[PDB]
Scaffold this active site. Structure first.
Site, PDB file in Angstrom:
ATOM      1  N   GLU A   1     -22.494  35.039  81.839  1.00  0.00           N
ATOM      2  CA  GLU A   1     -21.527  34.921  82.576  1.00  0.00           C
ATOM      3  C   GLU A   1     -21.265  35.864  83.743  1.00  0.00           C
ATOM      4  OE1 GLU A   1     -18.261  36.825  82.711  1.00  0.00           O
ATOM      5  OE2 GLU A   1     -17.383  35.016  83.509  1.00  0.00           O
TER       6      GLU A   1
ATOM      7  N   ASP B   1     -11.781  33.650  77.043  1.00  0.00           N
ATOM      8  CA  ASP B   1     -12.168  34.819  77.541  1.00  0.00           C
ATOM      9  C   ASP B   1     -11.335  35.705  78.005  1.00  0.00           C
ATOM     10  OD1 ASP B   1     -13.982  36.557  79.283  1.00  0.00           O
ATOM     11  OD2 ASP B   1     -14.613  35.071  80.878  1.00  0.00           O
TER      12      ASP B   1
HETATM   13 ZN   LIG Z   1     -15.309  37.568  80.430  1.00  0.00          ZN
HETATM   14 ZN   LIG Z   2     -16.280  40.274  82.542  1.00  0.00          ZN
END
Ligand SMILES: [Zn+2]
Ligand SMILES: [Zn+2]
Ligand SMILES: [Ca+2]
Length: 271
Positions: A131, A160
């Site tokens: 990511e 997240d």
């Molecule tokens: Zn993250």
């Molecule tokens: Zn990050």
């Protein structure tokens, strides 16, 4: 939905912490600490009865992986997915970003199994790689699902950075039904909520998405410290993308609340 035990979530975080310490200090794409993180999560899910798939891809010259876990059962034409990126930046262990999201999703997946839950919608959980290189893993996943499979997705929930040390409680403002579900959960606790990650690829293709976040490098305001406590004038996460994003960079209360919220949403939306 069951209460997710904070101790269990923390135990996964301790494991990720050790994996990083044993592999050069980080869990970044193309480095051994990443693959070792995937291995840990996969082992826990396989033992719990999930069907797991390793999806491999190449980015910047190195191989990365996404870990996909399907809970056998449910309507195949209505899939509810929840995910979190499992990679860190190479400066450190990435405990809050995003071991927090990764451990919460993992413990929720194990809770499903311990409870013998049989949802109406089929459940699928995912841990994304790369990511930090620009949502490469979630983009690969979405680009590789055929149209027919994509239209089966009833929603994608993203987690997240849900354990920020000086936290805020923010809810994504995308699908309203997802969004409401989370808001309602916080309302019952009497915690106010206010309104760049893996949900983007899905949102772009029309899948309803939502998620929770506790704040990054932005400064928490006076009014926000008033509502949630902590320290005004300091970042929500002073160790964002830093070598100090370690086990002590987690606020237990935020982590526990967000983990329980994730389970409540997944139970709620899958029925
Ligand atoms: Zn993250
Ligand atoms: Zn990050
Ligand atoms: Ca809990």
């Amino acid at each position: 939905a069951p209460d997710i035990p904070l101790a269990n979530v923390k135990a996964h975080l301790t494991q990720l912490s050790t994996i990083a310490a044993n592999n050069g200090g980080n869990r970044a794409h193309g480095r051994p600490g990443y693959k070792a993180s995937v291995d840990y999560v996969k082992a826990k899910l396989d033992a719990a009865g999930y069907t797991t798939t390793l999806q491999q891809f190449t980015s910047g010259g190195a191989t990365g992986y996404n870990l996909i876990a399907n809970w056998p059962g449910g309507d195949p034409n209505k899939v509810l997915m929840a995910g979190a990126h499992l990679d860190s930046v190479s400066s450190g262990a990435g405990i809050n970003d995003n071991g927090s999201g990764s451990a919460a999703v993992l413990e929720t997946a194990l809770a499903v199994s311990r409870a013998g839950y049989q949802p109406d919608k089929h459940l699928r959980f995912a841990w994304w790689g790369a990511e930090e290189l620009g949502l490469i893993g979630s983009k690969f996943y979405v680009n590789n699902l055929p149209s027919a499979d994509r239209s089966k997705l009833a929603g994608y929930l993203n987690f997240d950075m849900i354990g920020s040390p000086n936290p805020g409680y923010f809810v994504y403002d995308d699908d309203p039904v997802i969004e409401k579900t989370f808001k309602n959960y916080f309302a019952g606790l009497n915690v106010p909520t206010e309104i760049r990650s893996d949900h983007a690829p899905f949102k772009n293709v029309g899948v309803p998405v939502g998620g929770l976040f506790t704040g990054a490098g932005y400064t928490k305001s006076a009014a926000q410290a008033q509502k949630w406590g902590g320290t005004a004038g300091q970042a929500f996460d002073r160790c964002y993308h830093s070598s100090c994003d370690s086990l002590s960079n987690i606020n237990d209360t935020a982590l526990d609340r967000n983990s329980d919220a994730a389970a409540h949403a997944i139970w709620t939306l899958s029925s």
